[PDB]
């Protein structure tokens, strides 16, 4: 893990409910090269007790796709592992900063890879939160070229029976 720590006394309960992905600062060139065509990503969250049920939804080519992932508890309040589903590896996710009624900042780290996400309960996000997240990006040593903003419309709750990836 990088020099990062969770939200103090993180509460899975209040963090529960829908979150909208605002922006992702990442070294992953996938957002760099063809960072356009990244759909408005919504993230329904529910306390799986210690774990969190985390259903990402997207419009993959306009197909509404739910991807249900367990953010499994690592054993530290506000840090999660996501099973290590496959050669995707373990993904160390930390809720670094949030107020549960408007915004949260999540850190996601993989071997040689760090990524930070800004989520908001509603859109637009406050400018103070925006610039705070941009500071978090500087503290992650990422550049402005490595911040990618996700469109504000076309959120797609309710993937059907079949467009549900259910990675677990």
């Amino acid at each position: 893990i990088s020099t990062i720590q969770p939200k103090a006394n993180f509460d899975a309960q209040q963090f529960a409910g829908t979150w909208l992905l605002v922006a992702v600062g990442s070294a992953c060139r996938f957002l760099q090269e063809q960072g356009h065509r990244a759909e408005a990503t919504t993230l329904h969250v529910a306390p799986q007790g210690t774990a969190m049920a985390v259903s990402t939804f997207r419009k993959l080519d306009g197909i509404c796709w739910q991807v249900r992932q367990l953010y499994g508890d690592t054993g530290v309040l506000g840090r999660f592992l996501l099973q290590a589903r496959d050669a995707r590896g373990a993904v160390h996710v930390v809720v670094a900063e949030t107020d549960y009624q408007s915004f949260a900042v999540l850190y996601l780290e993989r071997a040689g890879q760090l990524s930070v996400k800004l989520y908001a309960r509603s859109l637009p996000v406050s400018d103070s939160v925006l610039s705070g997240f941009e500071q978090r990006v500087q503290e992650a040593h990422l550049t402005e070229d490595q911040i990618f903003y996700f469109p504000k419309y076309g959120f797609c709750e309710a993937a059907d029976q079949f467009h549900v990836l259910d990675e677990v």
Partner: protein
């Protein structure tokens, strides 16, 4: 996948599949490949989104 299933013998009286008649696994030094048209398996990377 399923190539072993075509190699089975067949009991016409029972219509049960029987033990492997053909070798489902021997390649005889052939390097022949079959395009898996349904290879295209959806993945999600939470880090890259």
């Amino acid at each position: 996948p399923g190539s072993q299933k075509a190699a089975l013998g067949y009991n016409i009286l029972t219509q049960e599949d029987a033990q492997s008649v053909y070798d489902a696994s021997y390649y005889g030094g052939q390097c022949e490949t079959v395009y898996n048209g349904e290879w295209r398996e959806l993945r999600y990377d939470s880090t890259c989104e």
